[PDB]
Amino acid sequence: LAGIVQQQQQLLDLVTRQQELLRLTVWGIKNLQTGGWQEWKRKVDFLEENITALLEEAQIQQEKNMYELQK
Amino acid sequence: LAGIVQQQQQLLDLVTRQQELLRLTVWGIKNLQTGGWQEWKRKVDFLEENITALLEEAQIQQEKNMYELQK
Amino acid sequence: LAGIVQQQQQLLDLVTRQQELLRLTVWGIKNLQTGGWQEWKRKVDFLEENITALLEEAQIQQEKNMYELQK
């Protein structure tokens, strides 16, 4: 199971890095933009906040899984 | 294994949410755009369709894993 | 554990496909862009390189996990 848990850490790191890149693409689009943009912004803001929260929760679950593994 | 299966659900939720954000960034780029854009669109369309299909398959696999766990 | 390992492959495939889509959105933004863009580019380049490396590492870990499973 150590390999499976390690793979989950690698996937978590990948999703975290992809979120960093997504944040940059959103910044880029907002910078180029300055219709339906008002609502676009509201949705993007919700997703960014929600994903950030989910990453934190996934990190906590990773730690619990590692704890149960190490114990 | 319950924690590992739960972590897979959290990663699936993260990728799903990131796809929602990606769909919005693609919408934003298309809106700003209106060269090599014709082919860019074809590739983006393929990826969006393929990822959507993969998310469905991952959800089904998650359910099967949860079933085997619960049983 | 076969189902869990298979689910990790599905998540890896999802993240890989999302990276392909992210690469396209970055290309699109760069094409539309032509301030803080110089640094934006430096950060995006770092993330693209780092994520590519992480995908390779995740693929290797997937293979090791599958090996231990098959053996």
Automatic annotation (TrEMBL), chains A, B, C:
Question: Where can this protein be found?
Answer: Host cell membrane; Host endosome membrane; Virion membrane
Protein encoded by which gene: env
* Designated name of the protein: Envelope glycoprotein gp160
| Coiled coil location | 37-64
